[PDB]
Structure formats: C-alpha cells, structure tokens
Amino acid sequence: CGIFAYLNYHVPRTRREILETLIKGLQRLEYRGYDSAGVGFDGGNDKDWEANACKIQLIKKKGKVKALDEEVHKQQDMDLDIEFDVHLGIAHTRWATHGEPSPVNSHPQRSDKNNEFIVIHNGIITNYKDLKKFLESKGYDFESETDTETIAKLVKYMYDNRESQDTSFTTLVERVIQQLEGAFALVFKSVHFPGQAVGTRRGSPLLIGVRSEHKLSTDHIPILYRVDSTTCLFPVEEKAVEYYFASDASAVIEHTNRVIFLEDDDVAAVVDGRLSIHRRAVQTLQMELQQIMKGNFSSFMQKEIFEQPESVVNTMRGRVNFDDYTVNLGGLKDHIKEIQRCRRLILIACGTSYHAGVATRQVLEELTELPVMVELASDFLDRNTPVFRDDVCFFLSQSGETADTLMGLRYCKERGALTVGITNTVGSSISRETDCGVHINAGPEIGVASTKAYTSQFVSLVMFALMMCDDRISMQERRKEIMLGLKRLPDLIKEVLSMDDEIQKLATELYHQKSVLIMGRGYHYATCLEGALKIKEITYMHSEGILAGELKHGPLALVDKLMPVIMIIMRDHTYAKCQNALQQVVARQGRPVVICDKEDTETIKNTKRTIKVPHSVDCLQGILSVIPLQLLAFHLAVLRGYDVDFPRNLAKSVTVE
Amino acid sequence: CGIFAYLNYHVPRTRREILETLIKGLQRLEYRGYDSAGVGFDGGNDKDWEANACKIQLIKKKGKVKALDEEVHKQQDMDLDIEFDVHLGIAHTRWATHGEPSPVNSHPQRSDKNNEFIVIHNGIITNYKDLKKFLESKGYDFESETDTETIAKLVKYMYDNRESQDTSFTTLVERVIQQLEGAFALVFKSVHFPGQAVGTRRGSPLLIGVRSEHKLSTDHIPILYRRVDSTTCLFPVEEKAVEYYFASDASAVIEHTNRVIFLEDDDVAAVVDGRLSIHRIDHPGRAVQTLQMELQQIMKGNFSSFMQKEIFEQPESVVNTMRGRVNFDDYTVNLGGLKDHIKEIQRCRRLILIACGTSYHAGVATRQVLEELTELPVMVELASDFLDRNTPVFRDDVCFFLSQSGETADTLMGLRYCKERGALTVGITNTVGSSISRETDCGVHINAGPEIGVASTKAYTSQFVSLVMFALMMCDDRISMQERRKEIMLGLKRLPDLIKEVLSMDDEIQKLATELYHQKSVLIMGRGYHYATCLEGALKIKEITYMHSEGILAGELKHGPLALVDKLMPVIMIIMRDHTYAKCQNALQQVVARQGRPVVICDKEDTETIKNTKRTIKVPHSVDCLQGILSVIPLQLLAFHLAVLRGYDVDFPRNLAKSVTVE
Ligand SMILES: O=C[C@H](O)[C@@H](O)[C@H](O)[C@H](O)COP(=O)(O)O
Ligand SMILES: O=C[C@H](O)[C@@H](O)[C@H](O)[C@H](O)COP(=O)(O)O
Ligand SMILES: N[C@@H](CCC(=O)O)C(=O)O
C-alpha cells in the first residue's frame, strides 16, 4: 500500500494543481499496491478558500491509479479552478489482499456521512474486531469491511468525549493509537482542524518532506512529551512552505530531497504550517530522480534487467580492488572477526531473496567451511527452528521490510544469534535491527519482480565469502579465480543481453503453452527455481523448477513431446550428470531448450534450440544463466498481452500478513 | 533385472516341475519391469538323468513371462517327464541396456554354439568394449550386442587356458570378475561342472535360499581365501537331499523357504556336490538368517492393483511398523535397532536426513517434531544436491538415510560420504540385506512389508511413523516433555482407526477425480506440518496421473506464485486445526479474493470452512505432528482414481531410463 499527502501552506495552488500532485504522488507509489486508489480533498466552490475547509470530498475508485486519474477529472460538480492559499489533501493506493477491491474498502476511510475525519492507513489493526463492537454500541455505524474504518470511527469517538473545547489534533490521535494494536502508518485530516495533518507510525514507514525557498528554523526537531518557535520546523521570516507526507521516498524526491524520517510512536503534527513531533533530523536524501525513471525503456523491469551490468558494478564499488585482489565490506569490518568464531550460517529470506541464498550456498560452504542452512522465512517461523548464540543469521531482503523475514530476525535476536542484514534500502527495519549488514547498492527497484536485486544479492554474498577465507593460503588461487570472474562479469552480462532477439524468438514458440519445466542442478538449482518463479509471476504460465538429479524419482513421468522443457547444462563438475538428465529427457521424447556454454559444441550439435552464454567461474555462472530466463519471462508476458510491471493478484514487498 | 536359479540335489524332480519352478520364480520378478526373459536347463531325453548333463538347452524370448511359459510347453522334441535326481536350472528377466530387446540379446547368454557355459546377468559391464576386442583377437566370435556376452565368452577363455584339468569352477569365475568393471550379479552354469552353480555380485543384490528336511551343518558360512571340507561349507548333515535357490530378490524365494544368505561384494558362492561354500580373494562369514516375509505380502489378493492394495492396507502397515516398539500400556518406545547406539546419538549436536523422492518428503514431514523433541538442529537434504555441494559433515553429526529399497545410488553414496568423515550413520530402510541397512552403524527396519507398487504409499507413512518413534526415544528423559509424549503416543494408538475413517471417504475422492479428470494442472497449497503433504501429493499426481501438479508453500503465495490463481486454475488447500490455522485461513482468503475456488482438505469439525467452501475433504483430527499421515492419503487416492479414469495402468512403471545403446 501507499500513502501520499500534499499540504501547501500559503503557497497558492488551484484545485487542479493539487489533484495532479496527489495522483502523481500515487504514481510514484503505485508499485506498492495497485488494486484500488483514492484521494481526499476540500470540496465546496467558494472563491474564498477559507469557507471551503469545512467540506471534505472523497474520490475513490477500483483499479490502478489511472482509473482514479480519470474519475477525478470529467466531474460535473468539482470546479478545478478554486485557488487555495492553504490546503491539505491525502491520497492512498491499496493492495487488497482480502475481500473485494471496491471503492468502499479503498482509502481514505471516513468516520461518518459528513466526513469529519478521514484517514489513510498502511498496515493492519490486530484488534479492529473488538474496536468495531465497542464503537457500534456507542452509536456508530460501519460501512466497509476494512480494519481502517475502525480508526476513523474511533478518532471521532475521542473527539466526541474530549474534556476541553480545543483539544489539539495530536491529543485525539494519541488516544486512538493507544487503543490500536498491531502496525500502522496513519495520516489524518479533519474539517475541525483545517489545514492540520497528523502523522503517526508504528512498524510501518512514514516520513515527511519539506520544501521552501526560505530558510528553515532548524535541522533537528526535538521530540516532545505530553511547542514554541524553538521547537517546530518552519520557514523563518515568511510562511511559504510545502509538506509531503509519504510512506516512501520516491513520491517526494521529485518535489524535494529534505525529509524527516519519523520513528515508532512519533506523532508528527503540522499546525499553522509548523511541523512538530510529539511522543528527528531534517536530512538530505541520497537519491537522484533518474534512479526512479524508466529512461528510454518501455518498462521498469526491462530497464532493471539491462542495467544489471551497472548495478553489479555499483554493488562492488569501493569494496573490490582487483589490482591487489582484496575485498572489504565496510558494513562488516567491526564484526567479521567474531563471525569467523561462529559455528553455523543461516540464511533467512522469502521468494527471490531466498533463491539468492540457494544460489550461493555451495560457495559459502566451500570458502567458510561452515555448515550453511537456507530457510524460507515463513516455514522457519512455523517450525520454531532451533537457533543458538554461536549462529550467524543472515536476512536477505531487498526492501528490508518483509514481514516474515523481519519476524525471523527478531526471533534470532531473542536467542542471542549474531544477525546480519543484506538489504537494498537504507534505514529499513532489517538494516537497523541487525547487528551489522551490507547495503547491496543496486538502486531502487520499481518492478514488482526482482531482477537486479537478485544478481546484486548474489554478488554481495560472494564478496562476503571472499572475506571469510582471505587468510587461507590454500584458497588464494581460488579467490583470485573468483575475483577475476567478477572483474569480467559486467561485460559478460552485456554479451548475454545482446541475445535479446534470440530469446524473443524462442518465446514466440512457447507463449501459447500452459506449462514449462525448468531443470538444473548444483550451482543452477537456484537458477531453475528463480526462472520458474519469474515466469509464474509475470506470464502466468505454470512453470516449475525441478532439481535435475530428482527426475528419475518421479517427475520425469510428466515429460513427453508436448511438455515444454528448459534445461541448464554448464561446464562445471556436474556436466556429465547434466548430460545424463538431458538424455533421459530426450528418451521420453522431450525436445528441450538448453541453456549451455558457447564452447559446449557437443550439446550445441545435438540440440536444436540452445541459448549459448559465455563461460564464467562456476560459482558465478548462475548470474549469467538466470538472465536469459529473466528475458524469456519478459517476452512471454508481452506476447500474452500482460503487463510486466503490474502482475495481477499482488504488488511489491510483502509487509503485512 | 531379475535372476532366479533352482538347484535340486538328490531331490528328484521332473523336467516339468523344474521348468514350472523357474517360470514361477520369474513371475515374482515381473513387477520390476522387463522386456524379455529366458531359461536354461539340461536338455536331452535320456531316461538316465546322469547322461543328459552334457546338453544345455536354452529357451529365450522377447515379451512377457507368460509368452515364455507357452514356448516352454510348446516344444515337440522335449520330454517333460524325465526325472532328475540332480539338476541346475537358471532363469532371467531382462531390462535392455546394451542391445535391443530380442531373442539373441536375451539371457542366458552362452559361450559357444554348444552352450558349454551360460550366464544370467543383472547390471552393466562398463569395459565390455575392451573385453570384446580382446576375446575377438583370441578367436571368439560374438553373436549379440549385449555386454553380458563378454562374460560368457571370457569364462570359456579361462577354461580353455586352465593350467590343470581339474581347475575349480570357482577359480574360473574369480578370474572373470577380476577382469570385469561395473556392476553385476551373476549365476553360471556349465556342462564341464554338471550340477554345480556359481554366483557372485558387485554392486547388485544376490541371495541364496536353502531348504532341506535334514539338519544343516551350520548357520554361519565361513569365508575361504585363496580347504573345502565338512567344517567350511553348508550342507545337510546325515543325508544329501537339499535344494538351493539363487535370486536377486527375496520375493522369488520366500514361498519355498525363509532361510537365506545375502552375498556381499566380490563374494563367489559355489555349490559343489550339494555343498555351499563362499570364496573370497575372529573369522568373517555369512549368516543363514530367517526372513519374516510371506508370499501373501506380495500378492494383490482381492484388490485390482498393487497401488490400491498398498494404500488401503495402510492401517495394517502402520500397526506392523509399531509392533514390538510402542507400549501403550506405559507410554514407552523402544527401537531395538538403536539399543547399542542411542547413548552416542543423544550426545551428538546435529541430525541430517538424507534421501531421495518420497523418502526425502518423509524427512520434511517430520523435521518439525524432530526439532521439537530433540532440540537439535535438523537438516533435510536431497541426496543428489548433498553430493554436488560437498556438504560439510562432522564427527558429531548423526546422519539418517531413508530408503525403502536401501539401494538408491545417491543415498548410498551420501552414506559412504558421511562415513568417511566420521559421522554416526543410521539407516531407515524397508529391505533386509540391502546396502544401506548393512553399511550404516545402526538402523531401523520400518517393517511395512514389501512395496510392489510403482509409487511409494505405505513406505512413506511407515517412514513417517518410524521417525516419530525415534523422536519419542530422544526425549524420554525430559520431565517437561512427558505430557507431549503421551499426547503423541495416544495419537499413534488411534491412528490405524483414523486411517480407516479416511479410507471410508473414497467415494468423495472419486467425485473430486471426475472434476479434475480433464484438467492439466493443479496447485496443492499448505504450510507447516503439511508442507510435505503438498510436495508428496504433487509428486504422486505427477508420477501416477502424468498431470502437472505442484506443491506450493502457502506462506509464499504473496511473493509471486499467487499470480497463477484465477477462476480456471484448480487448487487444493490443506487447512488443519493446529497452530498455523489462522495463517492458513489467510491464504484461503487471498486465493478466493483472486477468483480461486479451491478444494479444501480440513478437519471434520471445522464448521466455518466447510460452510464457506463448496467441496471439502473432511478428515478426522489427530495430533498436529501426525495429521500429515491423514492429509496425504486423500491425495494418494486422488492420484489413483485420476489414473484409472484416464485408462492408465497404475502398476505400470513407464519411467524408463536412458535409451538403449545399439552400437
Ligand atoms: O519476483 C519475486 C519478488 O522479487 C519476491 O519473491 C520478493 O523477493 C519477496 O516477495 C520479498 O523479497 P524482498 O524482501 O527482498 O523484497
Ligand atoms: O513415488 C515415489 C518413488 O517411490 C520415489 O520417489 C522414491 O521415493 C525414490 O526413488 C527413493 O527410493 P527409496 O526410498 O527406495 O530410496
Ligand atoms: N546389461 C545387460 C543386463 C541388463 C539388466 O537386465 O540388468 C543387458 O542389457 O542385456
């Protein structure tokens, strides 16, 4: 889900400039949820903007943001020309994991049939059922099935039983969160508090951006405890200021790079155009707009695939020195010594991030000599897996906010393990709560299906492995071999990308099929698993990854001349075993596509369809073998008329149950 | 693929009776699959059996054993009434590897046009190219494309170049195997050694059964290295009469006798003058042991298929797995196979379960309760990937090897890998005498009875129960776990009747089969204790029905796989009453929200889901760590019924190896 609100204080904006700012903000957040959207602004058509802050208009519609963008426009009642000197507008895109994605369930929610309080919520309230029964007895009627509505009907209940006639908007929100259980990121708007916003979070991201041509009164807002000119953030001499509430930074970078990342239970409140926190550091974001633009590509997923030569280079920047063959991950300098005294490595993650652990498990075992265990986070938790004080637990999460991965982290901390975060988002929960960690530095990933995150995690774990063995004489040559492979890896990725048209042709032969089996073993077990997941996610074909050594134990019965098959056969120590699996497939009349090395003349002669990739080091070849399957999934989705950036039934980053 | 030989020594038998015994032997060996079969026996119609010992007749044919039987009795020149006081007959079913199926490529292979030496073979001789060239240069002409013919020609080469006129049959065979490379089980017969048999193996099972109405000299045959007298071989004491049965599977011997000798690699067993000695190039020896197998255990009975039998007899196979091991009277578990090692095992620091296919799923299905009751790290590894990665193993690891057959190559090689690194090894097998049961430090026979069906059904549930019993042993000294142990053991007490209850819903499963009859895919979703149920059911439906069933971990749906859900994709979800119930309900709401209309396997009393879901398979509730046995059986039956509807033969393997090398 996504949160975005635009508060222009004494910065005249017409009702069109505002709605186009809310929609544009949701477009920056759409990748976090695109099942429905909605906006909440001030209604009325009075020239004097002051007489309009008592009327709240809600425009909510099912579908992506573009469905709401048209619903907002071509309306017969809203006059888009009213100039507002002060105005607050809130917006929200929803990932409807439950129920119907109807406008009634979309946000902003309301507290009554006159819109006295409207709230946009990211998260879950684990006790909304109890809150629902309490509010219904007092005389409140519910309309939607969402847990967010209980937050709107409750902020009004605290307002209908206040002690003084002018209790601050903060005090009302404070009494609400004290009754809410679970995680949430909230942004309130009320007719009684015109222009005033309140932003509180608990286990969910929520920052506040600020723009103003004038100087700001401070760069460290002091948190308060139940508010003068030496306490609030505001322009000194004048009042011109623009705020940007948002659950992510991509929705604010376009307007400003000065945000204030809140913290759990911090109740921010903009009053009279002054930001004050209740219960900070105005900082510059280290992000360029170009990082979240498609550039000259028609989709984010395509950009992020073809930019892997660059994102791989950025992952190694300032960390790999090829002149002297040294590896230094600054994030682990203070802990690498104690990590080596531990006795087991555990990798915990979900989805594609879990595959990154599978793809590097073997080389981690080789260079550390430690037992390495790779766990799906959801099953890790279900089994109450045993963890000990001398375990080193890695948590792979591009977003750094995945629910199951994050709960596994707190589980391992409680048991005394040493925790390490491999993330792509700075300031994320997983990056903060681990003892140490590494930012893979692949840049923002906007596509729902992870591509560069996978290859960057891959490289990051290999660099860690290289540190763990830099004192072993017997492993020096093996280290050099791997590092030379990394030096040559960016260009070899470019070579794979130059086969784009040859992949697209093979896709024209498969798009009509219902299933495809992707078979590999050893280093390329993860490759066939990740490729199957990618084809599932964006093409909707029933693709499954099968461990090649397991074919003879049952799954081979499914192969006939009609079943499409993709096999991975690389020139490593399992080559002969992979050739035997291939012969078993052919015996069953299978006609597979084989991803193989360019020099594998034997395979190239005896197979019609081959995808010939350049040879790298055996423990890096998985990066080159997966890219064709990224490209194949892309072209298949295009051939089938589907969107590669907005696959049905889900969104990016699972931060709730 | 199947070997059987019958040696009657001073037990008079007619030619008919001998041939009927050979045919019947091969019939017990068909379930493994084959493409041709043949028999070898003494020819000639001289009423005095002593003179017919120099004429070996062969009858080999491509096709089923039944066709071979018709060919046997369809011989106008053969008199089936001659009585033989001494005779050796050999039989074989072939699964072609070298040379296409044909009469010439069928066994027994011969050494010359006069059949001076014949041999039956299971396996592959790797160096059969080099051996064939050598024998050709010495003046031996080959007539088949099989690697086996090199064996028959080579033994005649050793005989032709023997140093003394009375070199033993054993010595010749020893010289043969010392030149062979690969895997083999062999039985030899020759006109120069009438009435004698030689059997040897390397990487392929070979056993010998024995029957006699007289007392036998010993029950422990001592090995002889390079004197054969009355103190070194097996024989009836006061009389000569005795019968011997060579076989590659005990299923072909059990109806005649339950006293067997399992041979080991590079053993050369010889019967000379009705006495059995074991040669090999304190004192080591081979035991004559008693098998608890019965002919009834390998017969369909009233069932129409072995798959159906082995599914519906699971209430009895579970009981057999627990017999003598669980005392419900006082809530105690005792696996006698671990008595001399349970102490060491409890001092180790990690459990590793290594297996393939459904046996691997048995480890996944019990990983959680093993972690709970042992409190040790439990790692479950697919044997093939375990080997590819050179996984780290240590002297304080306990490694379990799960294998119904006890012969799977990758599992066996994983075992030898762990033994070299000093780990304590444990075999969980269902086949006495198998390689994995022998080479492990200790083990448990799951005692489910032989599995004749192509797919693993009772083996999976018996492995399941066996690992639960081991877990119950590991925590028997913990005061805090007494209640939990009792709960689990009262679940085992009630499990046989709960299985019958599930099997009584067969009709409901058939209705589900008709719904999926025309479907090409189905997703099976579950988590926790029922992750293994999803994987195992998905594999069954793939293996038996040949449709694309896939197991999906429910907690992973929102990470990608949920994109496959729509109004057309068939989905089966498992929702049981355990600690993951709420999370499973959540996954169900996620599927329905995207137009999915899944079939739900749930508890009989889950009134909420039964009402909100159209088709539900309602199984009885049991302990959470045992429910996996009840939830997998409906998927066993579904695979069975779908296959029948589609006209498939569930007892037909299909899954063949690589193509035949014609050369
Ligand atoms: O293509 C699939 C997605 O990339 C998905 O599998 C993702 O990896 C997880 O849903 C969360 O992983 P992160 O925590 O790294 O975002
Ligand atoms: O339906 C499953 C098959 O029976 C197969 O997957 C089997 O489980 C493996 O081939 C391992 O065999 P073993 O258990 O005999 O080692
Ligand atoms: N390799 C031998 C025997 C194969 C077997 O049945 O095991 C052949 O093909 O004739």
Author numbering:
A (entry chain B): 2 to 227, 241 to 293, 304 to 681
B (entry chain A): 2 to 227, 240 to 294, 300 to 681
Article passage:
In the first step of the HP, GFAT synthesizes d-glucosamine-6-phosphate (GlcN6P) from l-glutamine (l-Gln) and Frc6P, releasing l-glutamate (l-Glu). GFAT contains two domains: the glutaminase domain responsible for releasing ammonia in the hydrolysis of l-Gln to l-Glu and the isomerase/transferase domain, which catalyzes both the isomerization of Frc6P to d-glucose-6-phosphate (Glc6P) as well as the transfer of ammonia to Glc6P to produce GlcN6P. The active sites of the two domains are linked by an ammonia channel, which forms when GFAT engages with both of its substrates, l-Gln and Frc6P. The main distinctive feature between prokaryotic and eukaryotic GFAT is the feedback inhibition by the HP product UDP-GlcNAc, which inhibits the glutaminase function.
To understand HP regulation at the molecular level, we determined the crystal structure of active full-length human GFAT-1. Tetragonal GFAT-1 crystals formed within a few days and diffracted to a resolution limit of 2.4 Å. GFAT-1 was crystallized in the presence of its substrate Frc6P and the product l-Glu. The product L-Glu is bound to the glutaminase active site in one monomer (monomer A), but is absent in the second monomer (monomer B). In the l-Glu-free state, Cys2 faces the substrate-binding pocket, while it points away from the active site in the presence of l-Glu. Due to the conformational shift of the glutaminase domains relative to their isomerase domains, the cleft between the two domains is more open in monomer A than in monomer B. This open conformation in monomer A allows conformational changes at the active sites with loop movements, which do not occur in the closed conformation in monomer B. l-Glu was found bound to the glutaminase domain of the open monomer A, while in monomer B no l-Glu was detected. In addition, there is a conformational change of the neighboring R-loop (residues 31–36). l-Glu-induced shifts of the Q- and R-loops trigger side chain rotations of Tyr35 (R-loop) and Trp96 (Q-loop), destabilizing the C-loop. Although both active sites are occupied by ligands in monomer A, no ammonia channel connecting the glutaminase and the isomerase site is formed.
